[PDB]
Every structure is written in structure tokens, then in C-alpha cells.
Amino acid sequence: MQIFVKTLTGKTITLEAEPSDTIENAKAKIQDKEGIPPDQQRLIFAGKQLEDGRTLSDYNIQKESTLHLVLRLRGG
Numbered sequence: 535m536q537i538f539v540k541t542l543t544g545k546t547i548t549l550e551a552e553p554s555d556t557i558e559n560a561k562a563k564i565q566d567k568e569g570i571p572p573d574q575q576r577l578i579f580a581g582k583q584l585e586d587g588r589t590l591s592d593y594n595i596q597k598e599s600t601l602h603l604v605l606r607l608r609g610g
Contacts, residue, residue, distance in 0.1 A: 539603035
């Protein structure tokens with residue numbers, strides 16, 4: 535799937551993932567692009583706060599669907 539997330543800084547990051555992938559994994563993939571450890575990340579999906587240990591599927595990110603990720607930095 536094509537994942538798009540906007541950072542606190544308005545930066546668009548594009549990632550590849552499946553519904554089966556975890557939120558934790560998604561954060562790790564973002565880190566590789568953002569440079570910010572998952573510890574400092576606050577990732578929200580369609581206004582709903584994401585929990586670690588969950589899947590993307592659990593939040594209705596199904597195959598060939600879309601995502602609505604809003605990412606903030608801790609301290610911001």
C-alpha cells in the first residue's frame with residue numbers, strides 16, 4: 535500500500551506497508567526517513583490515536599485503500 539504521513543513540520547513522507555503491518559513497524563519506517571525515534575513520535579490516524587502492538591488493519595487500512603496519518607513531534 536501507498537502510505538502518506540505529514541509530520542509536525544508539514545513534511546510529506548511516503549512509505550510502503552501492508553494492513554498486516556504493525557503500528558510500531560510503521561513508526562520505524564518513518565524514522566528511517568524523518569530521523570526521529572518512535573519514542574518522540576505521536577502518530578494519529580483520522581483523528582484516532584494509534585496504539586503500539588496493533589495492526590494497520592485494525593484501524594481500517596485495508597488493501598488498496600487510503601490512509602490519513604497525522605504525525606506530531608514530542609515537545610511540539
